[PDB]
Amino acid sequence: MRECISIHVGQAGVQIGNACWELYCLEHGIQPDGQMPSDKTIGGGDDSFNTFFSETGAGKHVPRAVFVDLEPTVVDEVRTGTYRQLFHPEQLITGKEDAANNYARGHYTIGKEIVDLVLDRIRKLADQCTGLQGFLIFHSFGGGTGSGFASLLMERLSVDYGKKSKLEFAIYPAPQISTAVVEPYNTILTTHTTLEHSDCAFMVDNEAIYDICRRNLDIERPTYTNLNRLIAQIVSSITASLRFDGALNVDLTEFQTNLVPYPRIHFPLATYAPVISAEKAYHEQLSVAEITNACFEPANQMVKCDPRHGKYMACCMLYRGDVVPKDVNAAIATIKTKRTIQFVDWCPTGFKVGINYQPPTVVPGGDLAKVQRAVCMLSNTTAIAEAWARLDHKFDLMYAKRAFVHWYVGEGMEEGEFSEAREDLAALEKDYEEVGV
Amino acid sequence: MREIVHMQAGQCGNQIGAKFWEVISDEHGIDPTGTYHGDSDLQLERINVYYNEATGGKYVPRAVLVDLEPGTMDSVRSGPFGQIFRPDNFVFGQSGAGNNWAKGHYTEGAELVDSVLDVVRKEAESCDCLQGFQLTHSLGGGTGSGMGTLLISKIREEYPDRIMNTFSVVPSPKVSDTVVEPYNATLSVHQLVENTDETYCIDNEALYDICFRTLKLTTPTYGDLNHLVSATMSGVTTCLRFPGQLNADLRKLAVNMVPFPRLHFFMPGFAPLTSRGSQQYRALTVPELTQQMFDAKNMMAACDPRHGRYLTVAAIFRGRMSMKEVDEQMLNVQNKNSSYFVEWIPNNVKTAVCDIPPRGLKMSATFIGNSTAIQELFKRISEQFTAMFRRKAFLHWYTGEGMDEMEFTEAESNMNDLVSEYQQYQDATAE
Amino acid sequence: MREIVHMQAGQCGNQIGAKFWEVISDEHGIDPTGTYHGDSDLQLERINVYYNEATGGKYVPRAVLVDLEPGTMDSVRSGPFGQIFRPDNFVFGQSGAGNNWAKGHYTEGAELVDSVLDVVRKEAESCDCLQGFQLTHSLGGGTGSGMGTLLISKIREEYPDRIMNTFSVVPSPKVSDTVVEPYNATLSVHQLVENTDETYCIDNEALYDICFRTLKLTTPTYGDLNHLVSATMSGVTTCLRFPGQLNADLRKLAVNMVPFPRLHFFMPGFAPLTSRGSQQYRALTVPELTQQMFDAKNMMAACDPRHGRYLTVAAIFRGRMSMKEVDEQMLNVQNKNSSYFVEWIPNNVKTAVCDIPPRGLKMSATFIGNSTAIQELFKRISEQFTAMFRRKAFLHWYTGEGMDEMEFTEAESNMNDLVSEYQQYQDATAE
Amino acid sequence: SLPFLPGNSFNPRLGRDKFHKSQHFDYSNEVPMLVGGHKPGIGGDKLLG
Amino acid sequence: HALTMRTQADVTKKLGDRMNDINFWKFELNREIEEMIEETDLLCAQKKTLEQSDRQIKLNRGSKHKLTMDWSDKLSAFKIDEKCTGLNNNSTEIQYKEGSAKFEAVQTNPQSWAEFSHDNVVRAEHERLASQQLRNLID
Amino acid sequence: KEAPMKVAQTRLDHRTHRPNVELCRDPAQYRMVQEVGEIQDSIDKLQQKLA
Amino acid sequence: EQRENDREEAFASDMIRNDKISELLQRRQEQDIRNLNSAMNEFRDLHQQPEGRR
Amino acid sequence: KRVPHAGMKTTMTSSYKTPSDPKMTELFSCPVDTPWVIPEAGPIQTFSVPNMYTTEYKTYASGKPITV
Amino acid sequence: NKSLADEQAEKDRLRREQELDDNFTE
Amino acid sequence: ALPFLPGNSFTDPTQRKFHRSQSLGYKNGYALPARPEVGIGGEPLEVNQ
Amino acid sequence: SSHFSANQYKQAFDSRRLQNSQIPQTYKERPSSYEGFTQIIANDRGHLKQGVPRSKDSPWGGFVGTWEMPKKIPGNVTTYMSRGDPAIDNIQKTRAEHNEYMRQAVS
Ligand SMILES: Nc1nc2c(ncn2[C@@H]2O[C@H](COP(=O)(O)OP(=O)(O)OP(=O)(O)O)[C@@H](O)[C@H]2O)c(=O)[nH]1
Ligand SMILES: Nc1nc2c(ncn2[C@@H]2O[C@H](COP(=O)(O)OP(=O)(O)O)[C@@H](O)[C@H]2O)c(=O)[nH]1
Ligand SMILES: Nc1nc2c(ncn2[C@@H]2O[C@H](COP(=O)(O)OP(=O)(O)O)[C@@H](O)[C@H]2O)c(=O)[nH]1
Ligand SMILES: [Mg+2]
């Protein structure tokens, strides 16, 4: 009955999808060939996998995912990888040319090449689903397929499916870490397109997760695998209550209601605790109050945006493990009595608590230690107006000289979309300052 | 043969009512497969208050499970005492309102009320007396508040004179567990005031305080909270379900509770309650039962009764006792605490005594009280509502699902009038 | 000793009647070879009603099998319980109507009705009392509708006083099953109004929801669909075959329902209906049996008697039960749902009771209703007919098979007049 | 499941691959007659008579 | 009744843990078999010094045979533990038999059985590395 | 107690067919042999009360 | 009165046993569906390899 | 001469490998056994209450005085 | 957690040996 | 060993399987409740009908 | 091209519980009733004769393809609350322009 269709667009989205589907296969006991390990006795005759893996009449558990990227490799790496038998051949869609860090290529010329095919696959998966909780779109604002085609797919999904829940996982561009030059252009255009065609877009960024891996896990070479493993743990703690028994159950259609106060303010943060290594987990108690304080500590954030400079508007706490609601209430009340954490005056009831009995899952060969309790904290501070200001300053800095505009012009968009995108983001910044005051 | 039709809606409803059914089944001697392994015939004499007779010794509960989303209903039908319910009494949707009163009341929740009323009509006309309906809902949620109050309104229109008892898990002073719970609580209590004739306000912080202080319990879990709530559900029905020296059914309780039609919010209580290693210090007697009832610690609401005035109060005792002892205890409480009771009503205590105690306990007692301290709960909800409503926050999620600001304004004014009524009856003098 | 002859026309009629002879051979103890292996003598005690006796112990059915192609009758003969039918009763042609009413009524069915009439005349003069005729067909096919209505017309010309029953598998509102169903149904109903004594309009979609919701069953299959239809026929006919406290044959049924001659279109219903694994929770009482009768979801037609108004209701309780429970439940359901009942007919329910329940059942109950809600079916058919006939859809087949357009206009006018009288008797008041 | 009953019937055709239908009725020269009686049932299964 | 049911639950849990251990070792040395086949095919392509290649390849083929011996043993143990975990009170296969509460003669510790499988895998890895060094020597 | 008594016993001898090295005295057989002794012990408590 | 109640209870018990037997047969038919699907997968893996196409 | 360990070995194939670890048992089953057995409430526990399941109507024509 | 840290240290040592081998076959 | 009275319920701290089997579901367009066969964690049900 | 309702059986036969989560196609349920007989308004070719009213819509229906859809979609907001007055004017203007674009593509 619970159904989440997971669309991974972009190279970042596809790699994060690899990590998250490895995590779900491990959590539901599905081997990489897509079958139960030659037994139907683990969990009995269970169908708790139905939230992620469609099941045929023979034991093959095909997932409910669509992996889309215009460029070859990466998706073809999934095709020729260890999880080759698990994924359906039409579930992995690949074009000929690459979007090449171009929002115009992703949105007008090359993105519209594959959008009918991707929508057809999404339609078949939705018709196979017995009642959708929503879509989970994994992408990055860096540019190209994860920006232009992601915005186009969201726009067409808003056309077709109406008021269906769309939960987004965006690798937001880091404040100083960057791997491209047109990241502000692509981010401004994608945000302007997807202000109205979105519900709740969780943000992560590579710089803050690098700092997390350096400080907590003590990894001096964090590659994208570790980053995607923490993102997989975040999305698994998000979706755990649809598939595991919990004291307080939260589903996918409550994250918009409990975290979007106003229709343009739909860009929440993300935090996971306790992100810890084995030698530090041997020392630390990792109690409920400790991890609850660690979530609101302004060093465990994964968005690289100090929330002391902003005011909390909403929070969604997702506890999992052998956590008790009595200590949950005690810790979340001590946070409210604490003065470092500051809330808006118009939201006294600013928390949504969801408790799940299932302990966190330890991947083999991973970096996180084995913990009995965990919190996935989902804040909605107005501190992100700082990041919007820095991004808008970069956009104006490259836009006054009209640099890199001729690529977008030659690939199918004029100056009007640039101008109205910057106007919309300035209006968004004024909205953030107004909702802050 | 006063039947009672049970209704559990929402996640909290489907948990609390399931615990209620598995604590009623042990009192009436019903095993998990549904047969009657009873000790005395007193368990079988009044089993039709909650059960319908089936083939053999099978007794099926008269409960309706309503939810817009499977989940905890699957959990309670896969746990113990979950296969006794009839599979047709499991009306479920597919989306879920999910902390949205508008989505639970004026959307896809409204295209389940036909099936729910079909099930309720079946279980209602499969009766002969039909004392009342009771609901176990969860003010602060989507399918507990909205859909539950919609069912309350429709069934109140169908059956006006029968009892419409509700058990509302109200929002907490500290900790929210839902961002939009002031909106949900106000929009649900607006329906509750005009529709229901008696409503028991259970608060999760009060349950936590009882389990942490009277019971210690280290790690309580929601099972013990639901057990406390369920014990007080059974405490107001034990007079119907077993013979006593002084019987008082739900209608007698309502008549001796509410002085005015808009004062039907009580604070329940169950007070044989000891710690783990505290049996050696309390040899249970009627006087310490009464002082544990009237103690502010063992009140299942955040409303301190010392910050108010007891309009009326009822006490349903179970077990073996002396009526002289019971009446002298309540008179002694009233005479010592004169200012905590309204002076224009003499003997605010309505006593009922049933001979049959709960199993294990020698004798028990259930406390319910209509006091003017519930204005603190309604005033806190009004304060949070007017904090969230001035800036129009989290309100497009309601007006896009299809309502208007006039309903919010009317609900706020209704609850303010409720606060004003409680305040004017708190400080009213005799002459 | 009152004999009735059974005719099957078309694919639907052939399969439904084959299942009907299967179930009424099972309840009479007839093995597939044709002999008798029943337990009690009551099974063969009134065996003359449905079976003719050959030499020895052979009991052939009193059935006529009509289809323009060997086809479905070939499957029936090469199916179980297919060897009991006499090979001389299989009347078939060579061409086969291509879902064409004009072909089944004017071209292909014209030069086969003589052979069918000779078979029917012989098999009816073999009778001793000859109560009447019953025909199974659909109003959506070529030889089911056209040849069936031609048979009805010729048989009413032959024997004008005998009872006529049709089982009339009507087109469904949802899905299609044939694209020329409005033409076939409009041309067949125009014959059924002026030539049938009673007509049970049976809907595939209503039977689908009956077989899939109230019986679960996952894959329903036409075996179970036709068996539900056959169970309704057995419950209708049973007072001829088994004794009871208050018996009622076909003429009693037709007299006590049909108020005015062109209002003999009924909705059948069989109401023991237990889902898989809910018999443990089932109570098995007369009030529950009557409640499962008088539920709108249990009708075998798409029309809603809650939308319409009941004219006459016939209930046959086939089994052992009490006149107390039966009569008081009929009175209670009437007095509660007096809105869905005509006031100018006081106590508009006929009650019949048999004594032999189905094998494996304690009690059964067949439901027949003559509500004014059945005008919705004819409104659907007539509106689809208008939408096709305005643009002359598929009309070249009917005109090229030698048949004019004034036949279509007269059929539509008769159906619209039928809806007019049904609405008139719905909204007419007492005084 | 021993009594017949509405809906209490299962599938004997389960797992079968052949569903061949034999022509039991045909016109020999001009008259209709049962040309079967020596032909099997559905899928080649033997009949009774 | 409570004690007998709860002991049965503990027995089923321990059988499930044993089944997981069998499945892990099964998959591990099956993967080792696959790498042995792939390395053998590469050595065949490199062969197409010759006597040394023949000896090393024969050692590889024998190590693959020993791994397959172990795989058959673990597959048989897995199919046994499947039905032993699946059996319960309601199942019909449950049967009278004579006194079977015995500890047999010469049995293995779990650590000794895991050590035997680990030594098989280590010997296969040594043969694989030797064949890789032989391929590098040829090239 | 008749069902769980033979659930143990049928499980033992079916686990004696482990071919060469899988015949293991794992920490499942230790609890499983004790189950045979315990259920027979608990039968004797019931039969003593039955007598 | 005892004979009336005994007849009603005996009929009811026959109902329960028939429904339980029917449900068990339905579960066996579902397992047969799974077995036929596995056999079809084995037939596709055996007789329908891409090299076997003409 | 290509380097042996980091020569041709893709990141996903070296990191997103098939899961294989001897500690998969602890993922879904605790090695610590549960330290209790709990039966249902019994007759000696529901009848330890003095004069249990009797009412005040039973003292009529009983012959015993009322000390309850 | 002790076993996890021990095998992570062993994997780190094997990493160091492999990277040293790559550096010296450069 | 204990009566069912408020704080006399003990939960197992060892189990970590949990999950949730989907029993109540939809097929075609209708509510099939379906018989539950798996508890919370694959443990057998205390009642088997 | 019609459903004409199912009375009791509206629990099923809606697209959301028929596993079709897209936007439903709305039909005309609760069918009407006529008095009898129809005008023929068509020849033996399916053509509409001279005089009958004809729809101004396209005879091939309306299906705006991917490459003729407008490059801007409004957002499906249907709330108009807590927005500025220029914001509401902008949403209404772009709704009108995109509806005009779809009408241009259809006809
Ligand atoms: N967390 C995480 N971020 C990634 C990963 N891969 C890429 N990114 C981020 O994605 C941003 C660039 O977007 P890409 O996904 O590479 O671009 P694209 O979606 O493939 O579209 P094109 O550039 O046209 O090919 C970079 O700034 C990275 O921060 C990954 O594996 N994990
Ligand atoms: N007493 C009690 N309260 C509960 C239980 N489950 C949830 N709640 C409370 O219900 C509130 C959440 O409401 P929710 O169940 O999500 O409402 P719904 O979405 O309409 O079902 C929280 O504040 C919890 O404190 C329970 O089992 N017992
Ligand atoms: N209930 C039921 N309906 C049937 C069966 N076979 C056909 N029908 C219905 O009959 C209609 C088609 O009529 P058809 O049998 O082709 O008539 P014919 O062409 O004159 O033989 C369809 O709407 C079907 O729903 C059956 O075995 N059972
Ligand atoms: Mg790329």
PDB file of C-alpha atoms in Angstrom, chain C residues 217-219 274-280 284 320 355 357 360-363, chain G residues 4 7-9 11-12 14-16 18-20 22-24 26 29-30:
ATOM      1  CA  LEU C 217     -12.356 -14.973  -4.105  1.00  0.00           C
ATOM      2  CA  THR C 218      -9.641 -13.012  -6.013  1.00  0.00           C
ATOM      3  CA  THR C 219     -10.141 -14.494  -9.486  1.00  0.00           C
ATOM      4  CA  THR C 274     -19.615 -14.976   3.436  1.00  0.00           C
ATOM      5  CA  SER C 275     -16.108 -13.844   2.576  1.00  0.00           C
ATOM      6  CA  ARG C 276     -13.244 -16.300   2.951  1.00  0.00           C
ATOM      7  CA  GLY C 277     -12.342 -16.512   6.630  1.00  0.00           C
ATOM      8  CA  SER C 278     -15.204 -14.433   8.070  1.00  0.00           C
ATOM      9  CA  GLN C 279     -17.599 -17.317   8.750  1.00  0.00           C
ATOM     10  CA  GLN C 280     -16.048 -17.552  12.221  1.00  0.00           C
ATOM     11  CA  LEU C 284     -25.842 -16.904  11.245  1.00  0.00           C
ATOM     12  CA  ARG C 320     -35.825 -23.912   8.613  1.00  0.00           C
ATOM     13  CA  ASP C 355     -37.741 -26.172   4.400  1.00  0.00           C
ATOM     14  CA  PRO C 357     -31.533 -25.244   2.760  1.00  0.00           C
ATOM     15  CA  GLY C 360     -23.614 -27.265   3.176  1.00  0.00           C
ATOM     16  CA  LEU C 361     -25.878 -24.395   4.296  1.00  0.00           C
ATOM     17  CA  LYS C 362     -28.231 -23.996   7.275  1.00  0.00           C
ATOM     18  CA  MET C 363     -30.474 -21.385   5.652  1.00  0.00           C
TER      19      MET C 363
ATOM     20  CA  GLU G   4     -32.559 -26.557  18.774  1.00  0.00           C
ATOM     21  CA  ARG G   7     -28.709 -28.246  15.581  1.00  0.00           C
ATOM     22  CA  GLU G   8     -27.813 -24.570  15.134  1.00  0.00           C
ATOM     23  CA  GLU G   9     -24.304 -25.084  16.545  1.00  0.00           C
ATOM     24  CA  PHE G  11     -24.731 -26.319  11.249  1.00  0.00           C
ATOM     25  CA  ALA G  12     -22.485 -23.418  12.275  1.00  0.00           C
ATOM     26  CA  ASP G  14     -20.034 -27.254   9.434  1.00  0.00           C
ATOM     27  CA  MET G  15     -19.898 -23.697   8.031  1.00  0.00           C
ATOM     28  CA  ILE G  16     -16.608 -22.977   9.831  1.00  0.00           C
ATOM     29  CA  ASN G  18     -16.094 -25.745   5.049  1.00  0.00           C
ATOM     30  CA  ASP G  19     -14.813 -22.158   4.946  1.00  0.00           C
ATOM     31  CA  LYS G  20     -11.470 -23.155   6.493  1.00  0.00           C
ATOM     32  CA  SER G  22     -11.892 -23.656   1.109  1.00  0.00           C
ATOM     33  CA  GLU G  23      -9.388 -21.065   2.357  1.00  0.00           C
ATOM     34  CA  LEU G  24      -6.652 -23.708   2.665  1.00  0.00           C
ATOM     35  CA  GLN G  26      -7.196 -21.237  -2.066  1.00  0.00           C
ATOM     36  CA  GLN G  29      -3.868 -22.790  -5.477  1.00  0.00           C
ATOM     37  CA  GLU G  30      -1.866 -19.595  -4.881  1.00  0.00           C
TER      38      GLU G  30
END
